[PDB]
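User: what does the whole thing look like in 3D?
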Amino acid sequence: KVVNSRLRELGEAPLEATGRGRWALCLVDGAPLRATQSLTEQDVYDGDRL
Amino acid sequence: MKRGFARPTPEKPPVIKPENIVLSTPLSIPPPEGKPWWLIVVGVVVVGLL
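Assistant: Here's the predicted 3D structure for the full assembly of 100 residues, as structure tokens:
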């Protein structure tokens, strides 16, 4: 929601897609993160990119 | 959240070695020794005139 809101202020179209599926966070190789575990459990730290 | 980092004893930097150098002294121009050219010139004439 905040990313879509911020995108409109930048004048960019919000994130949108069609078809069966879902929205989630992924790594640079496309691998999605675990949906039920803490970012402290995963190997995430300040300055990482997603 | 950040990853921990402990600074160890610094590794040895490459040692600088000074050098004292004394320059060579330039050569000296050979002083002007001179041949009595006219004397030998009269000689070949006298022996020739004979």
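In plain terms: The CA atoms of residues 21 and 32 of chain A lie 13 Å apart. The helical segments of chain A are 2-10.
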